[PDB]
């Protein structure tokens, strides 16, 4: 019924590893760029 | 009489040191008129949270009279001899100088010494100046250019001493005590940290003599003759944005940390800034100006003006640019500006540096146009390089600079660096830090 059974699962293995790795790297990059806004501070200094 | 020859024939700058540690330098010419003053290595950087703006407060009383002679007397005497009395206080340097007839070089030296040593600090005059300084802070608050540079330092050196403004805080100005100013003067206006400089038609030996006579009060301990090394100020890549769409034009300043006085690279950074140059809507040259950025500014009407700068300090500095533009042309201006900075690190030409070198030479020669400016050079040089640097040396250094050297030095201080940004006024069009940071590489 599914001659590709084994190969399918070997791919799933790599898919999972690459995914873990890639998701983490991209999570960091997203956080890195967004740090600018995330820690940003502001104040309202109206005149006299 | 060639450029080279004229440079070699310039009278040398004489320096001698008194036992108290004070240095006396002067360049002699044949002018009936002269300028002499005392350049002190003091400023806001030496102050702290409690006495910030004291050096400025002092600069306000340094001319309102001494102990030997009250206000009116001090003023009348100086005025009646046709002499000019000016001075200033910055972050790392202060100065009090006088312009007059060489015929009075000695009386002046006595006057200077009296100012730096016996300031009256009239209790009543202090409360009077407290209100004056408060009026100047409101006047200067409308000087976008200076508000912008203050902010640039406030963020670029946040957390440190160079972050404070020279004039100081409102709270400090409202609470500085007669004792604080007194303390300031005593702690900082000290012989080893000062320089008596003079230029014009004056005898170096006659200068040094009057100097020995009035600049005395020698020190006993070792803590009195040592020049305190200041704690390092950390540079921070960041931005401060003060938005007010009610302002007509926007000011923007971007900068990276510079090397500091003593570094030879500064000769190259100045050549670099010479390539980019500066501009303002009244430069007849127009669309033909050599400075690419300036040309674009004209073609696309990118700004009202822009200027480059390499502000040095003892251990650090600020290398960047500043422009003024309409709210709707900020983005293109910043784009072209950062673009030119990339071109520097990457594609500078020999022709480019050739021109910039010439421009830089006549620039240094122009800073010695008069007694005061030359006297200013001396005070600063000894105070920063601990020695005068002749135009011939500069020229020697400037001549060695080539395109490759410009690219390497610029790449060193600019390429892929996190800059310090200060924007004031109608700045909605100026893109975010991240986008600007990306303008720091490739391109
Ligand atoms: C389910 C029966 C599987 C028999 C084949 C065993 C080999 C499984 O392995 C996979 O087979 C694929 C195709 O054969 C190849 O393209 C893959 O590179 C290989 O890893």
């Amino acid at each position: 019924a599914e001659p590709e059974h084994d190969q399918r699962k070997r791919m799933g293995l790599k898919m999972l590893l690459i995914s873990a790795l890639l998701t983490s790297l991209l999570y960091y990059m997203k956080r890195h760029k967004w740090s600018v806004l995330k820690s940003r501070k502001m104040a309202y200094r109206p005149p006299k | 009489a060639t450029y080279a020859q004229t440079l070699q024939n310039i009278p040398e700058t004489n320096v001698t040191t008194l036992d108290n540690g004070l240095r006396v330098a002067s360049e002699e010419s044949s002018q009936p008129t002269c300028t002499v003053g005392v350049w002190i290595g003091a400023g806001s950087r030496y102050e702290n949270e409690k006495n910030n703006g004291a050096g400025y407060f002092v600069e306000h009383l340094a001319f309102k009279g001494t102990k030997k002679r009250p206000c009116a007397a001090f003023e009348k005497e100086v005025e009646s001899m046709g002499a000019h009395f000016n001075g200033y206080t910055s972050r790392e340097q202060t100065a009090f100088y006088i312009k007059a007839l060489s015929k009075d070089m000695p009386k002046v030296v006595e006057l200077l010494a009296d100012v730096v040593q016996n300031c009256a600090l009239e209790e009543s005059q202090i409360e009077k100046e407290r209100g004056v300084i408060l009026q100047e802070l409101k006047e200067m608050d409308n000087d976008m250019t200076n508000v912008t540079f203050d902010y640039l330092h406030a963020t670029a050196f946040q957390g440190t001493a160079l972050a404070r403004t020279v004039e100081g805080t409102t709270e400090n100005i409202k609470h500085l005590t007669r004792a604080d100013l007194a303390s300031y003067i005593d702690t900082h206006f000290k012989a080893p940290r000062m320089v008596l400089a003079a230029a014009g038609g004056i005898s170096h030996k006659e200068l040094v003599d009057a100097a020995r006579q009035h600049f005395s009060g020698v020190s006993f301990t070792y803590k009195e003759d040592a020049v305190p090394i200041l704690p390092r100020c950390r540079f921070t890549g960041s931005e401060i944005r003060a938005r007010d769409d009610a302002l007509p034009v926007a000011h923007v300043a971007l900068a990276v940390e510079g090397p500091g006085w003593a570094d030879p690279d500064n000769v190259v950074l100045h050549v670099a800034n010479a390539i980019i140059g500066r501009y303002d809507r009244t430069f007849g040259g127009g669309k033909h100006l050599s400075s690419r950025l300036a040309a674009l500014a004209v073609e696309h009407k990118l700004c009202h003006s822009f200027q480059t700068f390499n502000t040095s300090y003892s251990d650090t500095g600020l290398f960047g640019f500043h422009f003024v533009a309409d709210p709707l042309s900020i983005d293109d201006m910043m784009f072209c500006a950062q673009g030119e900075w990339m071109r520097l690190c990457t594609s500078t030409t020999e022709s480019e540096v050739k021109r910039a070198k010439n421009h830089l030479r006549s620039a240094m020669v122009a800073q010695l146009d008069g007694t005061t400016p030359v006297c200013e050079t001396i005070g600063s040089h000894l105070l920063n390089y601990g020695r005068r640097i002749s135009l011939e040396e500069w020229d020697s250094r400037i001549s060695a600079v080539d395109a490759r050297m410009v690219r390497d030095v610029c790449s060193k201080y600019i390429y892929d660096k996190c800059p310090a940004l200060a924007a004031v006024g109608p700045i909605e069009q100026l893109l975010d830090y991240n986008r600007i940071r990306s303008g720091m590489y490739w391109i």
Side-chain angles (χ1 to χ4, degrees), chain B residues 2-3 16 92 141 160 164 245 298 306 339 342 364 434:
Chain B
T2 54
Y3 174 60
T16 60
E92 273 204 328
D141 214 47
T160 75
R164 308 212 188 68
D245 300 329
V298 175
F306 87 75
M342 282 305 108
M364 70 180 181
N434 275 310

Side-chain angles (χ1 to χ4, degrees), chain B residues 224-237:
Chain B
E224 302 194 312
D225 68 325
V227 45
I229 310 175
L230 292 182
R232 296 204 57 82
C233 284
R234 165 196 64 191
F235 182 84
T236 304

Side-chain angles (χ1 to χ4, degrees), chain B residues 231-276:
Chain B
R232 296 204 57 82
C233 284
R234 165 196 64 191
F235 182 84
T236 304
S238 58
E239 56 153 66
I240 164 166
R241 292 180 183 240
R243 181 162 176 185
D244 186 12
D245 300 329
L247 294 179
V249 299
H251 287 238
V252 178
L254 196 68
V256 289
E257 204 192 325
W261 289 120
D263 199 318
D265 286 337
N266 280 304
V267 178
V268 188
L269 294 177
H270 282 301
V271 168
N273 274 176
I275 307 187
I276 291 186

Side-chain angles (χ1 to χ4, degrees), chain A residues 2-8 10-11 14:
Chain A
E2 68 191 15
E4 72 290 340
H5 181 276
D6 287 3
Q7 181 189 45
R8 201 227 306 148
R10 194 184 302 260
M11 284 185 51
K14 306 185 181 177

Side-chain angles (χ1 to χ4, degrees), chain B residues 10-132:
Chain B
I10 291 188
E12 191 158 62
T13 303
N14 305 299
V15 187
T16 60
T17 311
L18 310 198
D19 306 315
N20 51 7
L22 182 153
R23 278 165 295 178
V24 180
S26 60
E27 177 169 290
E28 170 127 50
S29 74
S30 46
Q31 297 190 299
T33 181
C34 81
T35 301
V36 313
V38 52
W39 272 259
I40 313 178
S44 59
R45 186 176 176 178
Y46 297 82
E47 311 169 322
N48 59 234
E49 185 182 300
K50 309 167 197 170
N51 76 324
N52 188 198
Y56 191 63
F57 215 130
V58 161
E59 194 220 82
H60 274 245
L61 296 165
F63 291 153
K64 304 287 178 175
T66 65
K67 298 165 185 166
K68 289 197 302 181
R69 59 201 97 182
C71 202
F74 180 74
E75 300 206 296
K76 177 181 173 175
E77 178 172 355
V78 172
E79 286 178 52
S80 54
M81 57 188 286
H84 291 181
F85 212 167
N86 199 65
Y88 71 78
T89 161
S90 80
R91 288 195 170 77
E92 273 204 328
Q93 184 172 306
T94 305
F96 302 100
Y97 63 86
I98 290 182
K99 291 176 63 62
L101 302 158
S102 307
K103 172 174 59 184
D104 311 313
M105 166 269 113
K107 165 98 290 182
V108 178
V109 172
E110 179 197 313
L111 286 166
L112 292 174
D114 191 39
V115 174
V116 306
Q117 293 170 166
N118 308 294
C119 177
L121 290 182
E122 214 52 277
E123 193 61 54
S124 52
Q125 184 70 70
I126 279 175
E127 300 304 306
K128 187 267 181 180
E129 298 300 300
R130 189 183 298 283
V132 163

Side-chain angles (χ1 to χ4, degrees), chain B residues 159-185:
Chain B
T160 75
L162 278 170
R164 308 212 188 68
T165 70
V166 176
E167 302 65 42
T169 306
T170 289
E171 280 308 287
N172 275 21
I173 286 167
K174 291 173 56 177
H175 301 305
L176 275 178
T177 283
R178 197 268 168 187
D180 309 47
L181 311 177
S183 174
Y184 181 79
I185 305 182

